[PDB]
């Protein structure tokens, strides 16, 4: 299912990117709800945790798609899956950077990146 895998990974990543940028913003107005020092602040924090949770869920499913990719796996698929792990480690790194404001969401970013670095060295040792 060699090239259908490249299709699903790229398009799912597009969805992740869209959901993540949408997410960044919902935070930014939460963070503009800062310097409030109320209902908006609470309902946005409420919408805050919603979006973050759903993004984490989708990335965890993509992390499962990554393990599917690795158990199924030549150089052009090695480089292509490298792109997936690379921007996946990038997007959740950014998520952590935001989660560090932390009104949970960050450790979920952690455990996902823990699977990421596990998969990364696991592939690097054989691809070398």
């Amino acid at each position: 299912e060699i090239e259908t895998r490249i299709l699903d990974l790229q398009t799912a990543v597009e969805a992740l990117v869209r959901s993540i940028r949408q997410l960044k913003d919902v935070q930014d107005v939460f963070s503009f709800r800062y310097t409030v020092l109320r209902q908006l602040v609470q309902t946005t924090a409420n919408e805050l945790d919603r979006m973050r949770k759903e993004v984490l869920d989708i990335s965890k499913a993509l992390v499962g798609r990554l393990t599917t990719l690795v158990d199924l796996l030549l150089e052009q698929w090695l480089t292509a899956g490298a792109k997936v792990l690379f921007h996946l480690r990038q997007l959740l790194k950014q998520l952590k950077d935001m989660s560090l404001m932390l009104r949970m969401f960050g450790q979920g970013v952690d455990l996902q990146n823990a699977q990421v670095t596990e998969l990364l060295q696991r592939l690097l040792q054989r691809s070398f």
């Binding site: 107005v29 963070s31 503009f32 800062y34 310097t35 409030v36 908006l40 404001m101």
Partner: peptide, 23 residues
């Protein structure tokens, strides 16, 4: 936490939705 080029800031008693836009 309080803005990239500016501090997060707005006037009181003004719709925050509008305030963020001007901000």
């Amino acid at each position: 936490a309080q803005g990239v080029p500016l501090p997060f800031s707005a006037v009181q008693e003004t719709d925050m939705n509008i305030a963020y836009a001007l901000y």
